[PDB]
Amino acid sequence: IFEEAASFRSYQSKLGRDGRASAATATLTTKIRIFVPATNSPELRWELTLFALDVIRSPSAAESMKVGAAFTLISMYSERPGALIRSLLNDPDIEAVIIDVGSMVNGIPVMERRGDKAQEEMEGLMRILKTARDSSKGKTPFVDSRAYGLRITDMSTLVSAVITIEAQIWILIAKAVTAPDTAEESETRRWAKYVQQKRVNPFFALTQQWLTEMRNLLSQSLSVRKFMVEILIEVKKGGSAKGRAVEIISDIGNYVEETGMAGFFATIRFGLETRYPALALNEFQSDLNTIKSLMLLYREIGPRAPYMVLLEESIQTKFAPGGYPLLWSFAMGVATTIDRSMGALNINRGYLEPMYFRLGQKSARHHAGGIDQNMSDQVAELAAAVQE
């Protein structure tokens, strides 16, 4: 009877989820040039890191070059850098041409030594690098200038530095596509952790100017974020020890999971986990059936789930908290009242209904935390603890 309705709501939610898309939908691939580490020697590499930092710093280079540069910069992790990028990079939007650098002996950019893309290629590069320097008022990547010039000579220094720069990319992911302004507070909080824990090599601490330029590149490019989230999923999978580089990524992951799905987890933490005596309220009769459908749906979305927002994954929209709005408005009302850390959150969403929120705020709070709906005069004594 009633059972059919609930099952039908669930049916709608899962209808047409299935099936495999026709190949005709395959979109025009965008060509990106990625210069990639040609040998496992610090001589070739350190210079290439400097080049890549500067490509991303450049006002003068085209966006197509800049994406490819960012891919160079955040593939320095690998034992075999070019192979790591080419083999894991898996998105239809973008078609890579991979160039293994020829020892990178021509200052900051790299040239085709024998077969020539063009003789002016180096100038397209020289222009890029000059514009980069000039527009940034001389500033090298690191906050203390000696580090910008370093030209490091051994594996030990290399790994110290590379781990440092990589960690500074991965600090960004956490907010680049969830709140790319307001960012500084959080990204500095995460910086402090890695340094205080001695996980990253502090000589290589990177300038706000460089970090903002990279944060913006991440916000505005899908193709980059796709590679990042591909790697972020791959290294999140268990059953491996990690040394310093991959370890910092994995560590950051524990902050990066669920990010930009605030509302979903918020309904779970506040309101739902809370289970006040008022859950069966008429609205809650349906909204609860909604949440059930949502949870089973979330399960079905599967391996991508922890990072849907970073992936721009459309399924994400369905998961968005506006989907159960009566229960959610009550979930903010309870959550704000009960958890001291919450409420600091940005609560301006259209699906908030004041009347339902007020009940959630007061129903819990005037309830002294839902004292009445808890399940030697235990009840009464707990009055002191409420302090209101």
Partner RNA sequence: UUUUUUUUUUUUUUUUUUUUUUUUUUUUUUUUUUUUUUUUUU
State which residue, 91 or 258, has the beta carbon closest to RNA.
Answer: 258
The stretch near a copy of itself (CB under 8 A) out of 47-55, 96-104, 141-149, 356-364 is: 356-364
Binding site for RNA (CB under 7 A): 175, 178-179, 182, 185-186, 189, 192-193, 196-197, 254-255, 257-263, 265-266, 269, 309, 316-317, 320-323, 325, 341-342, 344-346, 348-351
- Is position 359 an interface residue for a copy of itself (rule: CB under 8 A)? yes
| CB of 111 or CB of 352, closer to a copy of itself | 352
Q: Contacting a copy of itself (CB under 8 A), which of 103, 286, 345, 349? A: 286
CB–CB of 85/98 below 8 Å?
yes
- Find which of a copy of itself, RNA, none residue 277 binds, CB within 5 to 8 Å per kind: a copy of itself
Give the separation between CA 61 and CA 77, rounded to whole angstroms: 24
Cα of 232 vs its chain's centroid, Å: 9
- Which residue type does 234 have? E
Which residue is listed with tokens 């796709």? 226
**What span, in angstroms and rounded, lies between the C-alpha atoms of 139 and 148?**
8
* Contact call for residue 229 and a copy of itself (CB under 8 A): no
Q: Is 227 helix (H, G, I), strand (E, B) or coil?
A: helix
Chosen from a copy of itself, RNA, none, partner binding at 115 (C-beta under 5 to 8 Å by type): none
Tell me: does residue 289 bind a copy of itself (CB under 8 A): yes
CB contact set of 184 (below 8 Å; sequence gap of 6+): 208
Count CB neighbours of 145 within 10 A: 11
Q: How far is CA 341 from CA 19, 63, 116, in A?
A: 43, 40, 59
Task: Output the smallest distance, CB 231 to RNA, in A.
Answer: 19
The count of residues in the chain is 388
User: Residue 358's binding partner, choosing from a copy of itself, RNA, none, with beta-carbon cut-off 5 to 8 A by kind?
Assistant: a copy of itself
190 is in an annotated binding site: yes
Provide, rounded to whole angstroms, the least separation between the CB of residue 317 and RNA: 6
263: partner contacted, choices a copy of itself, RNA, none (Cβ within 5-8 A by kind) = RNA
> Residue 135 binds which entry of RNA, a copy of itself, none, with Cβ cut-offs from 5 to 8 Å by kind?
none
Contact pick of 262, 295, 345, 347 for a copy of itself (by CB under 8 A): 295
Burial of 114 (0-12, 13-18, 19+ CB in 10 A): exposed
* Binder of residue 60, out of a copy of itself, RNA, none (CB less than 5 to 8 A by kind): none
Question: Which entry of RNA, a copy of itself, none binds 253, CB below 5 to 8 A by partner kind?
Answer: a copy of itself
> Counting contacts by CB under 8 A, is residue 251 touching a copy of itself?
yes
Beta bridge partners of 97: 33
A 10 A CB-CB count for 357 gives 19
Asked if 314 is part of the footprint of a copy of itself (rule: CB under 8 A), the reply reads yes
CB of 251 to a copy of itself, least distance (A): 5
Instruction: List the one residue from 97, 105, 192, 355 that touches a copy of itself (CB under 8 A).
Output: 355
Q: Which residues pair with 33 in a beta bridge?
A: 97
Identify whether the C-beta of residue 296 lies closer than 8 Å to the C-beta of residue 325: no
Helix (H) or strand (E) holding 96: strand 94-100
Amino acid at 259: T
Eight-state DSSP code of residue 206? B
Among 15, 110, 109, which Cα is nearest to 54's?
109
The reply to whether 380 sits near a copy of itself by the rule CB under 8 A is no
Q: How far apart are CA 362 and CA 334, in angstroms?
A: 8
Residue 182 or 285: which CB sits closer to a copy of itself? 285
Segment near a copy of itself (CB under 8 A); pick from 98-106, 115-123, 139-147, 288-296: 288-296
Task: Please tell me whether residue 195 binds a copy of itself under the rule CB under 8 A.
Answer: no
118 in contact with a copy of itself (CB under 8 A):
no
Q: Is 194 annotated as a binding residue?
A: no
